[PDB]
Amino acid sequence: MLDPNLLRTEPDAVAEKLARRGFKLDVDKLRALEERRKVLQVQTENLQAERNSRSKSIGQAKARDIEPLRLEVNKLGEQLDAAKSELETLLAEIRDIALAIPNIPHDDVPVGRDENDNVEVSRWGTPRQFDFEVRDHVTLGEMHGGLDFAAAVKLTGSRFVVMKGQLARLHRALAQFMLDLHTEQHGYSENYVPYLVNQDTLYGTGQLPKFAGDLFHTRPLEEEADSSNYALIPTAEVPLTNLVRDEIIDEDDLPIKMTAHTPCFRSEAGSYGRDTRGLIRMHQFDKVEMVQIVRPEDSMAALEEMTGHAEKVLQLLGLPYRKVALCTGDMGFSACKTYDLEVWVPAQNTYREISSCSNVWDFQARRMQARCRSKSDKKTRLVHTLNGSGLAVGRTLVALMENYQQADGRIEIPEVLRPYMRGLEYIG
Amino acid sequence: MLDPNLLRTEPDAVAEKLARRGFKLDVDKLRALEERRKVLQVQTENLQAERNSRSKSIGQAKARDIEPLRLEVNKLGEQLDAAKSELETLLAEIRDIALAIPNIPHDDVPVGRDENDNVEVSRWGTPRQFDFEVRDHVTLGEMHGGLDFAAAVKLTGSRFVVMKGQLARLHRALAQFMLDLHTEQHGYSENYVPYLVNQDTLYGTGQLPKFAGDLFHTRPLEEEADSSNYALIPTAEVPLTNLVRDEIIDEDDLPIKMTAHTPCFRSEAGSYGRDTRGLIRMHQFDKVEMVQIVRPEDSMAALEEMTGHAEKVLQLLGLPYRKVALCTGDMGFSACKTYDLEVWVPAQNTYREISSCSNVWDFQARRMQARCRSKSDKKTRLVHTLNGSGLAVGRTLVALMENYQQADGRIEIPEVLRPYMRGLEYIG
Ligand SMILES: Nc1ncnc2c1ncn2[C@@H]1O[C@H](COS(=O)(=O)NC(=O)[C@@H](N)CO)[C@@H](O)[C@H]1O
Ligand SMILES: Nc1ncnc2c1ncn2[C@@H]1O[C@H](COS(=O)(=O)NC(=O)[C@@H](N)CO)[C@@H](O)[C@H]1O
Ligand SMILES: [Ca+2]
Ligand SMILES: [Ca+2]
Ligand SMILES: [Ca+2]
Ligand SMILES: [Ca+2]
Ligand SMILES: [Ca+2]
Ligand SMILES: [Ca+2]
Known part of the structure; x- marks a missing residue:
């Protein structure tokens, strides 16, 4: 595995070094996956924060009706699981490229x-x-x-x-x-x-x-x-x-x-x-x-x-x-x-x-x-x-x-x- | 593998020896398979002989019409292949028993x-x-x-x-x-x-x-x-x-x-x-x-x-x-x-x-x-x-x-x- 920060900051420089081994680095594919990853990472981390927050609202109200709040958290949880699975599929795609690089x-x-x-x-x-x-x-x-x-x-x-x-x-x-x-x-x-x-x-x-x-x-x-x-x-x-x-x-x-x-x-x-x-x-x-x-x-x-x-x-x-x-x-x-x-x-x-x-x-x-x-x-x-x-x-x-x-x-x-x-x- | 002639001539004597190891020899199953084997062996070997004979009749007549004779040999060949497969299935059944005996x-x-x-x-x-x-x-x-x-x-x-x-x-x-x-x-x-x-x-x-x-x-x-x-x-x-x-x-x-x-x-x-x-x-x-x-x-x-x-x-x-x-x-x-x-x-x-x-x-x-x-x-x-x-x-x-x-x-x-x-x- 090569330094992920080196593949992100200077992929053309890395591609040039690897070309001497006769290996073609797919720079365009890595860039496109990395840009989509940042979009999914922001969406996922916002869903993680809002789910963590709505779960704390339940515990708060439990001391002081928690049914409409429980439905909200279960829908948020489904949405987050879906966003995490979609993100994980993209991470596996990056890994399939990254882990095959000599x-x-x-x-x-x-x-x-x-x-x-x-x-x-x-x-x-x-x-x-x-x-x-x-x-x-x-x-x-x-x-x-x-x-x-x-x-x-x-x-x-x-x-x-x-x-x-x-x-x-x-x-x-x-x-x-x-x-x-x-x-x-x-x-x-x-x-x-x-x-x-x-x-x-x-x-x-x-x-x-x-x-x-x-x-x-x-x-x-x-x-x-x-x-x-x-x-x-x-x-x-x-x-x-x-x-x-x-x-x-x-x-x-x-x-x-x-x-x-x-x-x-x-x-x-x-x-x-x-x-x-x-x-x-x-x-x-x-x-x-x-x-x-x-x-x-x-x-x-x-x-x-x-x-x-x-x-x-x-x-x-x-x-x-x-x-x-x-x-x-x-x-x-x-x-x-x-x-x-x-x-x-x-x-x-x-x-x-x-x-x-x-x-x-x-x-x-x-x-x-x-x-x-x-x-x-x-x-x-x-x-x-x-x-x-x-x-x-x-x-x-x-x-x-x-x-x-x-x-x-x-x-x-x-x-x-x-x-x-x-x-x-x-x-x- | 035990001597097949010893399992055929004296299976009760063998079963007695194996009982000391706590192994139950299925003598009745072995006897029933062995008796069916002899029936299939005679049928198979008669089909093998008649197919070999009708094939020699073709070569004979080839020197001196071989079409009705060629059909006869191909039907005999199918019958023999079927008899051999059926016999081989019984042989595998005997083997599954024979090869599991300590x-x-x-x-x-x-x-x-x-x-x-x-x-x-x-x-x-x-x-x-x-x-x-x-x-x-x-x-x-x-x-x-x-x-x-x-x-x-x-x-x-x-x-x-x-x-x-x-x-x-x-x-x-x-x-x-x-x-x-x-x-x-x-x-x-x-x-x-x-x-x-x-x-x-x-x-x-x-x-x-x-x-x-x-x-x-x-x-x-x-x-x-x-x-x-x-x-x-x-x-x-x-x-x-x-x-x-x-x-x-x-x-x-x-x-x-x-x-x-x-x-x-x-x-x-x-x-x-x-x-x-x-x-x-x-x-x-x-x-x-x-x-x-x-x-x-x-x-x-x-x-x-x-x-x-x-x-x-x-x-x-x-x-x-x-x-x-x-x-x-x-x-x-x-x-x-x-x-x-x-x-x-x-x-x-x-x-x-x-x-x-x-x-x-x-x-x-x-x-x-x-x-x-x-x-x-x-x-x-x-x-x-x-x-x-x-x-x-x-x-x-x-x-x-x-x-x-x-x-x-x-x-x-x-x-x-x-x-x-x-x-x-x-x-x-
Ligand atoms: N299939 C093989 N049969 C016999 N010897 C082999 C075989 N493959 C490699 N070798 C020997 O094993 C040595 C080391 O193998 S290597 O794949 O080149 N390198 C390594 O395995 C490293 N771990 C350094 O040993 C080779 O130089 C060769 O001498
Ligand atoms: N899983 C095991 N881990 C470590 N030692 C073992 C294991 N199984 C057996 N042994 C050792 O290997 C010896 C020989 O194993 S055995 O199955 O009894 N007999 C044989 O394999 C014979 N081929 C004689 O060596 C045993 O006496 C025991 O000392
Ligand atoms: Ca030291
Ligand atoms: Ca080498
Ligand atoms: Ca090495
Ligand atoms: Ca000697
Ligand atoms: Ca032992
Ligand atoms: Ca042994």
């Missing part, structure tokens, strides 16, 4: 139309030169009998996997290493969160109203008929960021740095036939998430810090990657500025996204009413929120298996993971 | 009506005598700021939790310790499984057709409209046992011992107001599961082995418990024989279930068509399946926090968990 890109963001207009910022590591024909992680998984997509189709359907034996152990070791790194070295506090969330949570981080189709939704439970319309989380960013919903945080307690390891569930609608083979694009994947709740003036510095935390995962694992500044046309709905880390994937002869690190500015904080106050200044402001993959575990397994594969298909265990695998040097 | 209890199971008729088999450890008033895990969680039920209601709703900081780390350490124990010492192979499963999987392990109401169901995805009617798993027993669905296993490859650490999702319908406070009864809980696929003659020995594996978790953690033989009236739908382990919970002044270990006999194997064959004997048989909690992680956290609490609320970390917590001795 975040204003920060000036640091380079202008572009799509991913081909993204800017490379840095590169670390040198892609391995192989003495044999590179096998992809799917072929390597079949060789070890460790990645079974056919069993997952039998259990569920497409875009699911069953991992077995040592490769399952390896995927667990990766998550353990990530959580320990962020909690022991990077100052994040660990969290266990619900994997099902309500509508308020989804509106809070921006999945609702515009991206219901990106989620798996659960039918309500019959003994919780009106309070269990839930959706599976698409990322731990959703429950973690909402932990500060309706809160006033003492600025001394900022930054709040949270980490979680969760499964993530996505419908993966559209882009038909893209990443059909393997673990890159699944309906269920594990991800170690980093979330930061910070003071408005520290979010740009927190983005650099949190991106470096995700980069450290790749560096310690010895995985070559490139850091990319996403352009205006390739950013997510909530982001005002994003960096993607793209890991080297030897069988694809390219870098593939393994992390997305974003500064959300005050966009989710406005929706959640998450604020901070200095006891000194004695003034509240909305916080800034940030989220970053540290990392997507399935895609890290893809990168690890492919970069560390041996001639016979054995997987060399990265040095930093060996204490997580009882000092095991190779799988196979 | 497993026949094994003779080892003591006869009883409910949990108060269960038999204690053994006891290990001595409940701690405290020098202060015992705090429950909810009060201890508030003291540490580590178990937050209010944040989870905000994120989702009731029967959910948010764990924060060191108590979240502890819950993770418990799962790590369990998976390592079973994989390193007990011969289980680790697995990463889908947390969403299809209808075939749910029918396979017995959740369907009778217990749809015990599950969270997801609405179908619009781009997978006819293949995404899924449910969240209530236990890793569901995806793990189904890994042998439609398989013929070489008996040399038995036992297949599988472990997984997953979240588990349950609607928790009924028993209103039971275990309202705390982690004992949640909509989402973590559990380290053990599953065994064995030869029919080894399942009773495998039950003792798998129960001992769950007991070893409690012993190494220094948690007093009691082993209970469930009576006929307290067993789950699929089980033919179950042992429950009940851990000491100091604030409740009682033992609470932390594990359920079952021999399912060939009940799920029949539904899944999971079989084994000796290359020697050259004869197939249905396998036996077994499942056991090793353990429910949330309830282990309850037991750990309460049994290891200090006077000031600090949590002493069990010795065996200290290598999982970087040698940390206490939380707080």
Whole structure:
């Protein structure tokens, strides 16, 4: 959600910023609704005042015949309810527009139309030169009998996997290493969160109203008929960021740095036939998430810090990657500025996204009413929120298996993971 | 699913066994449906033969006028389709009865009506005598700021939790310790499984057709409209046992011992107001599961082995418990024989279930068509399946926090968990 006073005072300036993302703001519709709203607001508030006044006249006369007065108040009450419903219908119309508007890109963001207009910022590591024909992680998984997509189709359907034996152990070791790194070295506090969330949570981080189709939704439970319309989380960013919903945080307690390891569930609608083979694009994947709740003036510095935390995962694992500044046309709905880390994937002869690190500015904080106050200044402001993959575990397994594969298909265990695998040097 | 030949040859004997569970088998209805089935089966198979024959007469005459013959075959085809639909309606009626029948209890199971008729088999450890008033895990969680039920209601709703900081780390350490124990010492192979499963999987392990109401169901995805009617798993027993669905296993490859650490999702319908406070009864809980696929003659020995594996978790953690033989009236739908382990919970002044270990006999194997064959004997048989909690992680956290609490609320970390917590001795 953008600042409503910024949409009211300068809508042409906002429309100009949003045009860089390729989003057309309907300024004329917003203006026409806002002008009708002011007419209905005055009518409604006059009816509210007169009804409140005629109700007090009854109580007055009750002490000192209240029948003609009771009829007057019941007609006024009907008129007010009608005026309030008509006003509320217009408010819902404004909201349907307001809540579908993506975040204003920060000036640091380079202008572009799509991913081909993204800017490379840095590169670390040198892609391995192989003495044999590179096998992809799917072929390597079949060789070890460790990645079974056919069993997952039998259990569920497409875009699911069953991992077995040592490769399952390896995927667990990766998550353990990530959580320990962020909690022991990077100052994040660990969290266990619900994997099902309500509508308020989804509106809070921006999945609702515009991206219901990106989620798996659960039918309500019959003994919780009106309070269990839930959706599976698409990322731990959703429950973690909402932990500060309706809160006033003492600025001394900022930054709040949270980490979680969760499964993530996505419908993966559209882009038909893209990443059909393997673990890159699944309906269920594990991800170690980093979330930061910070003071408005520290979010740009927190983005650099949190991106470096995700980069450290790749560096310690010895995985070559490139850091990319996403352009205006390739950013997510909530982001005002994003960096993607793209890991080297030897069988694809390219870098593939393994992390997305974003500064959300005050966009989710406005929706959640998450604020901070200095006891000194004695003034509240909305916080800034940030989220970053540290990392997507399935895609890290893809990168690890492919970069560390041996001639016979054995997987060399990265040095930093060996204490997580009882000092095991190779799988196979 | 029970043996259909056993329901046909001796239904009174089966009804007698099932009566001990408090289940009334409708023998008269099954007999009446079975007798009508034989009438419809003969009519249908005669129509199938005559249609196949009149179709061959056409091809014959095509080489040598085929119009009166084509009309005859189309009328026969309509008659057969009608006879097949009528037969299929009767088959669905038999199935609705057959697939709602619980497993026949094994003779080892003591006869009883409910949990108060269960038999204690053994006891290990001595409940701690405290020098202060015992705090429950909810009060201890508030003291540490580590178990937050209010944040989870905000994120989702009731029967959910948010764990924060060191108590979240502890819950993770418990799962790590369990998976390592079973994989390193007990011969289980680790697995990463889908947390969403299809209808075939749910029918396979017995959740369907009778217990749809015990599950969270997801609405179908619009781009997978006819293949995404899924449910969240209530236990890793569901995806793990189904890994042998439609398989013929070489008996040399038995036992297949599988472990997984997953979240588990349950609607928790009924028993209103039971275990309202705390982690004992949640909509989402973590559990380290053990599953065994064995030869029919080894399942009773495998039950003792798998129960001992769950007991070893409690012993190494220094948690007093009691082993209970469930009576006929307290067993789950699929089980033919179950042992429950009940851990000491100091604030409740009682033992609470932390594990359920079952021999399912060939009940799920029949539904899944999971079989084994000796290359020697050259004869197939249905396998036996077994499942056991090793353990429910949330309830282990309850037991750990309460049994290891200090006077000031600090949590002493069990010795065996200290290598999982970087040698940390206490939380707080
Ligand atoms: N369907 C998918 N299957 C597997 N991995 C995926 C899938 N979708 C995304 N990822 C991985 O998850 C990472 C983070 O996803 S994101 O949508 O870009 N961003 C977020 O979810 C933020 N909360 C930061 O993690 C991606 O960089 C990618 O590595
Ligand atoms: N709703 C719940 N919340 C928390 N823990 C639960 C809940 N339901 C069951 N458990 C725990 O999970 C254990 C196993 O559950 S069970 O239904 O008895 N049996 C199974 O699921 C079998 N697959 C063996 O694990 C129970 O012994 C109990 O310790
Ligand atoms: Ca501070
Ligand atoms: Ca974001
Ligand atoms: Ca992205
Ligand atoms: Ca063998
Ligand atoms: Ca069972
Ligand atoms: Ca039970």
